[PDB]
Symmetry: C3
Subunit: 675 residues, 3 copies
């Protein structure tokens, strides 16, 4: 379990009574009891309240809050408050403030924006975390540490620049090695001294947020910034554990957030927690893919849903209300994919600055006779009833899909071959296909152990890191199947091209040679024409975005282009390789083709759907011992019917036995317990 | 009259002989005479010409201009020249230059951009104003002072930041009060010293022009900037009044310009003057609303049209020629809404820099045989003919619609609930409905006395200021009808939410409780469904943008939503309150629904249309003594006919007597004199 | 010839073996012989490799490259390496870095971005040029000097600012003359000292690229910046010519690149060279016009095609592969319009940074068995077989269209009359009309000798320079036809309006007076209605963007507007003037009208198509001695057939005799040699 002393799916969220008074806190306790709320995330943004100058610390108000919540038997997710530095500190110690992408020195404002290489910031953040741990070391209600808050953003100040050079010295050892990695002979970029090197932003190598002259520099700086933030986190963590070695430590991540390499972060965290905030056009399968990734970060370990709105958001263009049931629906979607907590931002609405129109359990009227409140209490009852049932359950997926931040950085920094190529979109195209068929799958790192899987899919694996090619070769020869695509195997860890023919280190296992690649204008398409019927693939489908023009060397050709100067050349190939097979997909296909391909690939490895269901009804499974929990989630706004199978099983949410034809209400959820 | 010694609608405008020579001035005099031009606004932009260093003043060139115009008996609107500082001053005294929203120190260039807290600017602008007044104190031709020119724009420099803290001291008195007002417990923003507070711009709290982390700070900064600029105007005003206490002082405003609180500015001005420059998609009823607002800034006092182009604009994307008659049409529209002058920018085209392709009465050919000159001359004759007939005439509207700058600021900084909410558009939707039925209306401040009205409409009255609620409870209690909408009564003067349930202080009088609001995606609607036929309202209408979910408490329900999860809940309510009635409109309805709603509200109070006319034929009324003047303006490109009523009346522009059916030419104007 | 010792069309391009090693060079040499490559442009971006500090120069690596190429008898276009300064130089001498348009001091990065008024840059660029020239002065393989690389971009630094003041001193002599030229009495802009004048960028007079308060200042600053960069070129040129007085010097221009007055630049270069890079929506007639302009820069002298991709680009949004045959097609199109070289960027793909996905002859596989390579080898063989046949051949067009950078700057800076006015587009509309009918034309300076022409077309000649009016009066009177358009003859060289009536200095020769101009909203149109049938002009055509409202004075009206308030007024006039005729075109016509007008005008002067061909089949002629070479180029994806004429002639590319009907393959090229 996340914490043995708290044996259920935690229910609660961010709580900020220091924005109120003791009277309202009494109302909070009353209503939290009605809602089934038993965890509070406190002290996230009270650094200034605590520390008014470099020498004074007042924890008396916090003692009160903690003592009051303990009376109620509410557990504490205790934050270190380092998510936003005080105004006095920004004023006296400007080294704490970031210089931005546009080259500008910031003044005090906002949050999440301390320079991670700031001596002042590091000094005081470490001391604050240490004092909190020391003061509350012996307290029984603290069940989790919450370090800072949503780390992110880049800094380009002088301190980061001098520290970038050190990081470079440690990484490459010499200027010969550095100049080679960065290919500095290009555009007379030869460096003869480390101080000649600068941070890449609007002043130097970059423009428009994602464009650069020097991908090598831009890539490394992102590694460097991610590492620097990670060091701040590690620093607070170590200091916490000095005083409370037995209390878990987390920080709250942002899913597919692009700026941080979360695979590297998660190795440093006792458990992953994250903040799920969907856009109004975010596909339900996308947020599934994100919970999945969060699971994946520690190779299947259940994570905390640290934040989600219980109602409306504030920062979307059009902050629509969450329709009845949806709050519940989306909470159980998180649990289905590995969450062992569902926690909100936030418990009581602020009054406030920019978050006053962000949803909360208790809102502006200040009472419980509210739709949003009702729905929350309802979820709270259920979660109380589930108890420890699902806790620690894991995915036993036989299909994996690979994602990587460094690959993503190189791709997004690349120029070009096409701005229409979006890495996360292509990755999602494959995951979605799996999602619609209810094929249980894991999002994994390129580094993951491949032996649990029968199918490993790696969309646009543009960057191939040391050991990767050999791991997939070994995995395929042993009998696995590997899928990859156009613009894969192009470069190494430094974004230098692997010479001698794409896909380079994967050339042999894919059994094809990609000669050149064609980028299509928006709205232009080519067609995938099957050689002959093959499983659920028949006739023609369309494809777009990019078209690799390849040569089958060892692989069998299964489909070929139907149009353009490369008509009649392969677009889908299969290479037998030891006991396994590899498929190369040379274009970006429509959903029907991927539906077919995925079905074929799973059938070939004997992997079956969890269940067959109508479109919109998602199924995912977690397993505990030899017990299987099928989450069936109806995203449709109408009652729905599906075949739930004949075996004996019960819906954990209703207690009722289920067998055969079953219906599931609109926006409904069932948790099928079975062997 | 604006000035007794000048007893007609003033005609002329901005005039810049100092760009030319004496020879061209003789032609100028000749042509002004042809066009019936009798007023010139001079010396707007010659500070550097007057003052070449900190010690030298040359007024002789200005003496000759004033003397030459005097011989012609042309009246002088004399500007102070402070609307653009001299280059030598920017170079020697950089404190005069602004720091922009991006945090950059500006260099010399442009205009209207002096730092309002510059000691140098204030010093010299005050001396200049004083020297001018003292020099021309005994001149008979000067009928108006034109202070500076179009004050506007924000400054984020060091001096403003320091003055901002002082303004905060004067306003809140203590850090305790400021900390509460700004809700600084959020994001650890507690200030322990005033010096820790900074200007909110791209370096601190804000981004992309209208977004902010802390709207309380951003709201206050805009107040402070508006006051700061206002002080500069008051400074010059007082200096002018020392020497010429009997010459009126104005400064030229920009209508619905968002950055300045003109209601507060207007108290300090002897007469409002404004510059009307419509966009190519500006609806004619909007510019009517703008003129209307200009009249309302001083509670109905007539104003000056200080600027409008006689022909093309220069800064619109597409500067279309003003079709024949349109110039006249639009000048009379201004008069129709309270303009007692009609003035142009400018009398002769510059040659020039950025305004060489802005229209003028005298243009690049340098003669009067021009489409634009002929149209200016025609109007000139009519204004001579009208004499004092219309001067001082007032609006006697019984319908008022409220608009407020602080409300606006708070709304446009808010996040969100929807970027599709535009404060001014919502206001205009109500105005347009009255405009279309020729219901004589007043644009009014939230502070205006309500006693003279029967219908008060306050769209999106998000911010509710001290004394407002009482003021309106009393207006409804004693028989008035008050109309407000979704997202009203949410916050107070500091943008802090008023707790306990929307619409807060308006809850009592509105007799409803708004539980939650729903932002619709663009192109989505809900529907307004009437319980039963009510007056002009019948069946279903569409509504969109935002849908408020409300509970009738004291109010009764006249219509309910026709779709979505809040289908069948109130969207329109009527509350009997004392002798009067308040209507709550929970969404943003289409033009048809508002037409119905307006008619019913007017009928209910006994207010009738001025006149019934075809679409695009505008009718507005100004009353003088007991005499009524009906301005009738045909925006249509073809002849239109209407029934003018049976009472014996003459068109002042023709002398003809009108009764019953009457035709108006394309772009035509009539002014009907009636008792 | 470009260089007499190398008597064929040069084949090769940018070559960068310093990114590689001696061994890969051996492979370069083998493949270059296969491809028929005989010229390499070396040393473009190796400043830092040559010069590690302010005192050290290493040329040995370059010696090695030059020696190896000589063995293979490959000729050298030697660059000076000044296109990108070293990182140590940026670090130690920051005066080398630019200040950008937003006012920021840049840091080391990118290229083409040395401050042209940098003492350090000039000191070291000169020395480097000189050392290169002195070292290789006696070398037999050097056939061209390639100064720097793609000069461009503006600097707003302190040094440029102080030198701008000096350049103004030299140009105007007195503040009196400067204030007048800039019309500084506008907006109190009077300068009393040169140091009060600052550069026009985001901090002062300008915003968002092309908007400005003071076009005079903005216009001169671009002249100054163009001159500054030109001085850097001249400085290197002069140093090179000190040591090798008889080796040609060039620098690679960028065609219709807006920031530099290439007509001024070309007088300083021995031969023009340029870099042809189309957008995916660049019309084939546009790239033709660009080549044509490059020819026009030195009045018909053949130029060097210095760069073009042999395959894909890297900086286009969607970098599509060049379809089979297209590389060759576009290469011959360059030759048709005056290229006496065809060279690529680049010979071997970089590996790399931002250019690794830019095409090359030798690509990432590293061998010649590639579609792209085969196509390059094929072209190279053709070029070896052509020999010196076509060298020095020139255009004998009788139609010219004028283009001007200062005119372009003034039009792009103007506000407004319309942002839908795009000068280069209007220019292309005329050129395209000619290109579609295969009318041989020259793009020319406004300063070119008009004697050689029968039709001269000057679309939007908004700025009219000293001597221009007189030169075209003489041209028309002696028998030429002259065409200009709406919005011409408006200003002088200082962007000051020529008073008295548009089109000012052109008013006499055009025989019309343009009273006013009307900007149309996008999508809006008028119609051109012919008075009677006139040659290929019949009935009614559509027109848009701007409609000039004019009066015929001496000219007769061939066509009038068919709509709006100026319906019935002239839109197309003809003025008989001496033995010639001038046509005024008062609006922007559709392509049908322009087809008709062009045919009419050519017929009127005895000029006929080179050949009638189906659409997309382009024809251009170069003449050498008594022999005419007709380039026929089939832009269509399909075979095409046309009448090649009766005269006895052969295709240079096939050796075959062509007479009467001939068919051209898709993407095909024929070069007909005739009398
Ligand atoms: Zn930093
Ligand atoms: Zn300021
Ligand atoms: Zn410079």
């Amino acid at each position: 379990m996340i914490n043995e002393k708290f044996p259920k799916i935690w229910y609660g969220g961010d709580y900020n009574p220091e924005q109120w008074d003791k009277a309202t806190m009494e109302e909070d306790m009353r209503m939290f009891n009605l809602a089934g709320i038993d965890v509070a995330t406190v002290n996230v943004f009270s650094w200034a309240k605590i520390q008014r100058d470099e020498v004074s610390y007042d924890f008396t108000w916090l003692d009160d809050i903690i003592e009051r919540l303990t009376k109620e038997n509410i557990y504490l997710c205790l934050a270190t408050s380092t998510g936003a530095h005080p105004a006095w500190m920004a004023k006296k110690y400007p080294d704490v403030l970031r210089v931005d992408y546009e080259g500008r020195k910031r003044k005090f404002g906002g949050r999440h924006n301390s320079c991670p290489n700031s001596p002042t910031y590091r000094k005081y953040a470490k001391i604050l975390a240490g004092k909190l741990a020391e003061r509350y070391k012996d307290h029984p209600q603290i069940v989790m540490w919450h370090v800072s808050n949503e780390y992110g953003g880049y800094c380009y100040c002088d301190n980061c620049e001098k520290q970038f050079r050190v990081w470079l010295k440690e990484r490459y050892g010499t200027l010969e090695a550095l100049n080679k990695a960065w290919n500095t002979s290009f555009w007379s970029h030869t460096f003869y001294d480390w101080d000649e090197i600068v941070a890449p932003n609007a002043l130097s190598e970059e423009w428009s947020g994602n464009r650069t002259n020097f991908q090598g520099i831009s890539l490394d700086y992102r590694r460097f910034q991610s590492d620097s933030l990670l060091e701040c986190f590690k620093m607070e963590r170590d200091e916490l554990k000095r005083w409370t070695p037995d209390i878990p430590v987390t920080t709250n991540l942002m899913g597919f957030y692009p700026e941080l390499d979360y695979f590297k972060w998660a190795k440093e965290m006792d458990v992953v927690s994250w903040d799920n905030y969907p856009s109004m056009d975010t596909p339900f399968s996308f947020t599934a893919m994100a919970h999945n990734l969060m699971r994946g970060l520690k190779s299947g370990q259940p994570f905390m849903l640290m934040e989600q709105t219980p109602g409306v958001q504030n920062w979307q263009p059009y902050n629509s209300a969450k329709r009845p049931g949806v709050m519940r629906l989306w909470s159980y979607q998180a649990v289905a994919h590995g969450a062992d907590t569902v926690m909100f931002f936030q418990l009581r609405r602020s009054v406030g600055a920019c978050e006053k129109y962000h949803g909360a359990v208790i809102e502006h009227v200040g009472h419980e006779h509210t739709r949003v409140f009702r729905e929350c209490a309802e979820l709270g009852k259920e979660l109380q009833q589930l108890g420890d049932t699902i806790l620690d359950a894991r995915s036993e997926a036989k299909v994996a899909v690979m994602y990587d931040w460094e690959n993503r950085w190189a791709l997004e920094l690349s120029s070009g071959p096409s701005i229409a190529l979006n890495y996360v979109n292509e990755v999602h195209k494959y995951y979605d296909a799996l999602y619609k068929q209810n094929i249980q799958t894991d999002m994994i790192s390129v580094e993951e152990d491949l032996s649990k899987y029968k199918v490993v899919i790696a969309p646009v694996m543009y960057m191939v890191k040391p050991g990767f090619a050999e791991r997939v070769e070994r995995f395929v020869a042993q009998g696995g199947t590997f899928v990859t695509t156009f613009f894969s195997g192009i470069v190494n860890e430094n974004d230098l091209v692997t010479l001698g023919g794409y896909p380079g280190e994967l050339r042999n296992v894919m059994g094809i040679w990609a000669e050149e690649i064609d980028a299509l204008l928006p709205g232009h398409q080519n067609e995938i024409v099957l050689r002959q019927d093959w499983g659920g693939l028949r006739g023609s489908y369309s494809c777009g975005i990019l078209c690799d023009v390849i040569h089958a060397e060892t692989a069998e050709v299964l489909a070929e282009y139907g149009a353009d100067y490369y008509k009649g050349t392969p677009v889908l190939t299969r290479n037998k390789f030891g006991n396994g097979q590899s498929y190369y997909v040379a274009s970006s296909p429509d959903a029907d083709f991927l539906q077919g391909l995925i079905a074929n690939l799973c059938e070939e490895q004997g992997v079956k759907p969890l269940l067959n269901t109508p479109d919109g009804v998602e199924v995912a499974e977690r397993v505990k011992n030899g017990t299987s929990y099928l989450f069936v989630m109806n995203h449709n706004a109408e009652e729905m019917t599906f075949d739930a199978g004949a075996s004996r099983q019960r819906d954990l949410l209703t207690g009722k036995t289920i067998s055969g034809q079953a219906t599931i209400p609109a926006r409904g959820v069932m948790i099928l317990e079975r062997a």
